[PDB]
């Protein structure tokens, strides 16, 4: 009854926003999702996601999508490999644990979520630019100069959201590490040396402060990421131009001088690199207790943190579960109280996850680290 005759708008059709949409809409709420991506066919760059039983999988179950997730997810082994290609540990998958946290492609996840929504729930090509309250409703203005209205706004548009003002003025901060990601499509053909070294398992390696993570089978592509402490020179002078492949390759081949040729080949064979400083949206300061209209935040928009904890999507999916529950479970007598309780709970597990992620980051990039 809280949401009677209420138009709810979710900003962002990432995993968290689509899951929030589903959890509300299945209860007959009036939901719209605004997504900047041009259309549903847009390729989502990055690695695979794994849903944990007590958070992400619980959200999928509550949404009716757990078996669909299992159908499309792949259980993956993991090898810890030294810089010379020697496997130090092979942690293959046990049929016992195949459903513990199988890896799902990000586009596959978006599709099962989209398929669970009514048609035309997501409005594509809508990059929200301004969000200001008018009367008792929010005014949403998009890059394409269109405008829309809503009674409640849930911000789920990622860690770099520019529309957080009415919730908090806290700013994103860099943590001191940097990540470079890329894909090699059809790796069996195009990087056979490294693909064979992976041996059908995810690969992790750490050397001289440089971490390499790779997944040889993300829907026909090998995805890899190289992470390190941000060079201090970058702080003032830019040394690597991430629009110039050859600039990136020259830097990485320098860093990877001591590594086996199969790793150097992987770098030489990548057509395009994506470089990003690790960031956090810290939960140190409380959010604003006075807001002009109902608004809150979920996912990375709420608690962006370094991904080396394996945290990330599962916290966001718990946000959607708790916020959706609060809004539909009859326990609260206003939207504001339902939101405030959600934020209370999220700050709790969010602060915990952020603290673990910073510890792990400090440990993983120390020169003594060994997995
Ligand atoms: C290098 C790296 C590796 C990671 N690895 C993992 C991992 O292994 N496991 C894990 O669980 N997590 C991982 N994470 C984190 C995980 O990807 C995020 O937690 C997760 O994607 C957050 O989902 P979200 O829906 O909050 O935001 P996002 O996935 O960022 O989705 C936000 C959506 O909003 C859209 N959007 C943005 N701005 C606007 C706008 N103005 N208007 C409209 N729409 C907009 C975006 O296009 C996008 O669709 C990793 C993160 C990084 C950076």
Residue numbers in the entry: 23 to 393
How is this structure described in the published paper?
We determined the X-ray structure of Tet(X6) at 2.2 Å resolution with Rfree/Rwork of 0.22/0.19. This FAD complexed, anhydrotetracycline-free enzyme structure consists of a conserved architecture for type 1 TDases: a characteristic Rossman fold containing an FAD-binding domain, a substrate binding domain, and a C-terminal bridge helix that connects the two domains. The 393 amino acid long polypeptide chain alternates four times between the substrate-binding domain and FAD-binding domain. The FAD cofactor is bound in an “IN” orientation in Tet(X6). Thus far, the FAD conformation in structures of type 1 TDases have only been captured in this “IN” orientation, while structures of type 2 TDases have been solved for both “IN” and “OUT” orientations. The conserved FAD-interacting residues include Pro26, Val27, Gly28, Glu46, Arg47, Thr59, Arg117, Leu139, and Val324. The conserved substrate-binding residues are Gln192, Arg213, Phe224, His234 and Gly236. Met375 of the C-terminal bridge helix also interacts with the bound tetracycline substrate and is conserved among the type 1 TDases.
TDases are class A flavin-dependent monooxygenases that covalently modify and inactivate the core tetracycline moiety. Here, we investigate Tet(X6), a type 1 TDase first discovered in a Proteus genomospecies, by determining anhydrotetracycline-free and anhydrotetracycline-complexed X-ray crystal structures. Tet(X6) inactivates all classes of tetracyclines demonstrated by in vitro enzyme assays and phenotypic studies in E. coli. Here, we present structural, biochemical, and phenotypic evidence that anhydrotetracycline binds in a substrate-like orientation and competitively inhibits the type 1 TDase Tet(X6) to rescue tetracycline antibiotic activity as a sacrificial substrate.
